[PDB]
């Protein structure tokens, strides 16, 4: 695609009897994490997680930290408010999640911005795509919506998503150009797993690719075996790259009617793979 995104992921969770609610924030460019903050660190601060961010100066790290400390206290206040909205006891633990950010095209221009929130894993409130209105999922979120309309929050989101977000995303893409703007193609192969005397498993592997977006499909006689293909969730290798496999059960002997097809940004052209015994 050559288009890119920046996302921040905020989590705040209550733990009554075990101190004040914990606050964690992580920042991503595409599938690369680049910052973290944990209010449970001995010295809480926004800390680098990718080498291209370490070069930012202190005023950068000072601002990122002071904002996250404020948010630690604000999200504790939100968790008290949300407990109220749902008439919930002070003994249970609850979770607030937020993710926000921007998508830019291969020219650095904003495609669209995002800000969504979840309470206890349930969609709660989302900034609409117009960046000026909200969608509340229930009468509790409606309360949050009235506060935000009065606080004039959507206008602040628009100014952040159109301005700072894409400018700093653009800057990161340049500072981390050798990695963020490098698609590494998958290394692939097909393995063969005898099951019985009359059927076997063909497993198609994709290793070492980046970013994680990828297509793996089996075809039998040129027709997709989507209902019969077992997919694992794309998984991280630990080294920035990802892994994935697709598997199909085939009658023994018919193995050549089956093809595995691989799409990824790193490959010059899509791949067709067969078992070669």
């Amino acid at each position: 695609m050559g288009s890119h995104s920046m996302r921040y992921f905020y989590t705040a969770m209550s733990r009554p009897g075990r101190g004040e609610p914990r606050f964690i924030a992580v920042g991503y460019v595409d599938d690369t994490q680049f910052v973290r903050f944990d209010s449970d660190a001995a010295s809480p601060r926004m800390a680098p997680r990718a080498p291209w961010i370490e070069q930012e100066g202190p005023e950068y790290w000072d601002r990122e930290t002071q904002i996250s400390k404020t948010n630690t206290q604000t999200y504790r206040e939100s968790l008290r408010n949300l407990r109220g909205y749902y008439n919930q006891s002070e003994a249970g633990s609850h979770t607030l999640q937020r993710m926000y950010g921007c998508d830019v095209g291969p020219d650095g221009r904003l495609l669209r911005g995002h800000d969504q929130s979840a309470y206890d894993g349930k969609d709660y409130i989302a900034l609409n795509e117009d960046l000026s209105s909200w969608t509340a999922a229930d009468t509790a979120a409606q309360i949050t919506q009235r506060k935000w309309e009065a606080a004039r929050e959507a206008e602040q989101w628009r100014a952040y998503l159109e301005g700072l977000c894409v400018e700093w995303l653009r800057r990161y893409l340049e500072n981390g150009k050798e990695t963020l703007q490098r698609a590494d193609p998958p290394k692939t192969h097909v393995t063969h797993h005898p099951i019985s005397d009359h059927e076997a498993t063909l497993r198609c592997w994709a290793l070492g690719f980046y970013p994680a977006e990828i297509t793996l499909t089996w075809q039998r006689d040129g027709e997709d075996q989507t209902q019969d293909t077992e997919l694992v969730e794309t998984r991280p290798a630990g080294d920035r790259t990802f892994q994935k496999w697709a598997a199909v059960v085939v009658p023994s002997g018919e193995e050549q009617r089956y093809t595995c097809h691989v799409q990824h940004e790193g490959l010059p052209k899509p791949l067709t793979l067969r078992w070669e015994p």
């Binding site: 996250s68 999200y75 607030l96 929130s117 506060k147 606080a151 929050e153 952040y160 977000c165």
Partner: peptide, 9 residues
């Protein structure tokens, strides 16, 4: 860079 801290929920 993060957004300015805003209004509580």
């Amino acid at each position: 860079t993060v957004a300015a801290s805003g209004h509580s929920y």
